[PDB]
Design a protein around this ligand. Structure first.
Ligand SMILES: *[C@@H]1O[C@H](CO)[C@@H](O[C@@H]2O[C@H](CO)[C@@H](O[C@@H]3O[C@H](CO[C@H]4O[C@H](CO)[C@@H](O)[C@H](O)[C@@H]4O)[C@@H](O)[C@H](O[C@H]4O[C@H](CO)[C@@H](O)[C@H](O)[C@@H]4O)[C@@H]3O)[C@H](O)[C@H]2NC(C)=O)[C@H](O)[C@H]1NC(C)=O
Ligand SMILES: *[C@@H]1O[C@H](CO)[C@@H](O)[C@H](O)[C@H]1NC(C)=O
Lengths: 48, 36
């Protein structure tokens, strides 16, 4: 499914959670912040 | 066809997408179809 362009949700705001088309990765604002906070290691994407 | 998981030989890449049958991995799946 997909969200409609309109957001007539009785004033309720989901901006920080709904996907942001601007970012290539459609991670929500909150999810991107979480990823930044986390410090992963060994992604393994054909590492040198 | 180079892929994230590595390198495959003997198959053919296509643009059309379906439900995965034999997960190769990293968003890549294999299927036997037509010709065949
Ligand atoms: C749901 O939640 C989001 C996020 O709050 C709302 O989007 C706008 O958010 C801003 C503040 O976060 C609201 O306040 C005013 O925004 C005006 C311009 O808005 C945009 O400006 C830049 C564009 O890149 C963004 O940073 C900003 O988040 C908005 O996208 C400005 O008059 C002010 O924003 C300023 O904020 C900081 C400085 O404090 C900087 O980013 C910029 O200098 C920017 O000018 C002001 O704070 C705004 O009213 C919100 N609505 C809009 C833009 O339409 C959603 O609107 C909200 N939706 C609902 C239904 O509640
Ligand atoms: C279609 O396949 C070829 C190569 O596989 C190339 O045109 C491109 O990668 C694909 N383009 C689209 C729109 O599928």
């Amino acid at each position: 499914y997909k969200t409609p362009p309109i957001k007539d949700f009785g004033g309720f705001n989901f901006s920080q959670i709904l996907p942001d088309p601007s970012k290539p990765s459609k991670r929500s604002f909150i999810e991107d912040l979480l990823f930044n906070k986390v410090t992963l290691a060994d992604a393994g994407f054909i590492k040198q | 066809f180079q892929t994230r998981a590595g390198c495959l030989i003997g198959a053919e890449h296509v643009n059309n997408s379906y439900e995965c049958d034999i997960p190769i991995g990293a968003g890549i799946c294999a299927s036997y179809q037509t010709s065949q």
